[PDB]
Amino acid sequence: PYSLQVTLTLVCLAGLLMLLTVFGNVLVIIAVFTSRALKAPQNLFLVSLASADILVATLVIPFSLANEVMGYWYFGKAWCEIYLALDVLFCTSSIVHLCAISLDRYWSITQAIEYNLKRTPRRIKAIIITVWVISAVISFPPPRCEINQKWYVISSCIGSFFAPCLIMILVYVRIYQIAKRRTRGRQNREKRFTFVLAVVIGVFVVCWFPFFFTYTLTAVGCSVPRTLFKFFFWFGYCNSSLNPVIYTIFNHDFRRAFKKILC
Numbered sequence: 530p531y532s533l534q535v536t537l538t539l540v541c542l543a544g545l546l547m548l549l550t551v552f553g554n555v556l557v558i559i560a561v562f563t564s565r566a567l568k569a570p571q572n573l574f575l576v577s578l579a580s581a582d583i584l585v586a587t588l589v590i591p592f593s594l595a596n597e598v599m600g601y602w603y604f605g606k607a608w609c610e611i612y613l614a615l616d617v618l619f620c621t622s623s624i625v626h627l628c629a630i631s632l633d634r635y636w637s638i639t640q641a642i643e644y645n646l647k648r649t650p651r652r653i654k655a656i657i658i659t660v661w662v663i664s665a666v667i668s669f670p671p672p673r674c675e676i677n678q679k680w681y682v683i684s685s686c687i688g689s690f691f692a693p694c695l696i697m698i699l700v701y702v703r704i705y706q707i708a709k710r711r712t713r714g715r716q717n718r719e720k721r722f723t724f725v726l727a728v729v730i731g732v733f734v735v736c737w738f739p740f741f742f743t744y745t746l747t748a749v750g751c752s753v754p755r756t757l758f759k760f761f762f763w764f765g766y767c768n769s770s771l772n773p774v775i776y777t778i779f780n781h782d783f784r785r786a787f788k789k790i791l792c
């Protein structure tokens with residue numbers, strides 16, 4: 530199974546991850562509904578994403594720790610089929626939310642004056658209610674608790690990630706082009722948005738991409754170590770802990786609001 534000494538090392542590596550995922554994603558929620566500066570229609574995208582992150586960290590991580598360190602699935606076919614489907618529903622509801630947050634972050638730059646009148650909270654709510662529906666329609670497409678259909682396994686990874694990745698890298702390379710085109714505030718206005726954009730579009734790729742590449746690489750059947758895949762699995766669940774910080778710390782409004790709650 531494991532070393533026991535390690536088992537306490539793995540559980541403490543997690544647990545802290547859970548506390549960090551339900552500390553940022555909750556600080557975002559207690560911040561949008563609390564500060565009169567974030568009461569924008571566009572700020573509801575960060576509350577549903579935070580809810581999804583808090584849900585993953587406390588509904589799929591506690592049991593992933595169990596399946597991996599214990600070795601067997603203590604439960605059977607009554608929180609295992611629910612766990613393997615609530616994972617694909619809580620991570621595909623974070624990737625697709627990151628895609629939406631970037632599309633509403635790009636239509637308001639390229640279509641700047643026409644989009645505000647089409648940005649009412651009703652539209653934001655109707656987009657949040659659709660991202661969630663699609664996130665759950667990918668999870669449920671109508672003793673080891675390990676994932677077990679090649680044709681579907683691709684459809685879902687490509688729609689769940691490749692698509693949100695390709696439509697979010699483009700929405701950030703056509704925003705970096707627009708913004709640097711405004712410059713043509715002294716050698717740091719650009720040097721800051723080269724980093725504010727690089728972190729935003731790179732933490733995603735360095736957290737989630739390796740897992741999905743390996744999963745479809747094994748979907749085609751190219752061998753990936755049994756280990757060196759467990760790092761990737763846990764790497765994604767650890768990206769939801771950074772998501773609440775990436776989309777909030779680079780914002781002066783959010784930063785001044787956090788100062789009030791934690792003065």
Ligand SMILES: Cn1ccc2ccc(C3=CCCNC3)cc21
Nearest residue numbers: 616617620621685686689762765
């Ligand atoms: C097989 N598959 C298709 C889409 C999709 C989305 C997320 C995940 C997981 C996220 C972290 C580790 N557990 C699985 C798996 C997924």
